[PDB]
Amino acid sequence: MYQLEKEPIVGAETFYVDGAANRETKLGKAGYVTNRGRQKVVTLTDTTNQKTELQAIYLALQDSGLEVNIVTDSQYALGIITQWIHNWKKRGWPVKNVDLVNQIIEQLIKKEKVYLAWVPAHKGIGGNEQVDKLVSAGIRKVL
Ligand SMILES: O=C(O)c1nc(Cc2ccc(Cl)c(Cl)c2)nc(O)c1O
Ligand SMILES: [Mn+2]
Ligand SMILES: [Mn+2]
């Protein structure tokens, strides 16, 4: 893949990703739930909300087939990734989380097709609410 899909890929698994991190303990979780009934969560040490969001996208790319829809609510993650795929297109190959954004880009290009979309957090979107509950458990006191 060298460019993202403009629209959802019909017949491809859709991953709803999210991450949460505790400001005090710096413990966090990254994870996904999919429309095919799969879930995964991993716990991360010494992490940040932004890092968990990138890690969740990495997990979705690792565990998905060659065509995949990924729905994030992270403005940062979508922004920093998008900035890469556009750069690539016009300038060719970030300061924070550089190793991780690179791992993600290297995953993306090996896919056949990827649709990556943003939705607003805590607005009742079903898959998104489910994964948020998963990664926030034991991490985020209250909303
Ligand atoms: O990725 C995020 O940026 C993200 N941002 C928030 C903050 C937020 C957003 C909307 C509402 Cl309505 C509230 Cl109360 C808090 N929470 C999350 O769980 C989350 O994943
Ligand atoms: Mn989020
Ligand atoms: Mn969340």
UniProtKB/TrEMBL annotation:
**Its GO biological process terms?**
DNA integration; DNA recombination; proteolysis
The organism's superkingdom is given as Viruses
- Annotated residues for binding of Mn(2+) 3: 18, 132
Give the record's keywords alphabetically. Aspartyl protease, DNA integration, DNA recombination, Endonuclease, Host endosome, Hydrolase, Metal-binding, Multifunctional enzyme, Nuclease, Nucleotidyltransferase, Protease, RNA-directed DNA polymerase, Transferase, Zinc
Provide the protein's localization.
Host endosome, Host multivesicular body; Virion membrane
The UniProt annotation places Mn(2+) 1 binding at 18, 53, 73
**Domain RNase H type-1: residue ranges:** 9-140
Which of this chain's residues are annotated to bind Mn(2+) 2? Answer: 18, 73, 132
Spell out where the chain crosses the membrane. none
Q: Which GO terms describe its molecular function?
A: aspartic-type endopeptidase activity; identical protein binding; metal ion binding; RNA stem-loop binding; RNA-directed DNA polymerase activity; RNA-DNA hybrid ribonuclease activity
One Gene Ontology cellular component annotation held by this UniProt entry: host multivesicular body
Please list the residues that bind Zn(2+). 46
**Where the protein is mainly located, per its record?**
host cell
This one is known as: Reverse transcriptase/RNaseH
Which species?
Human immunodeficiency virus type 1 (HIV-1)
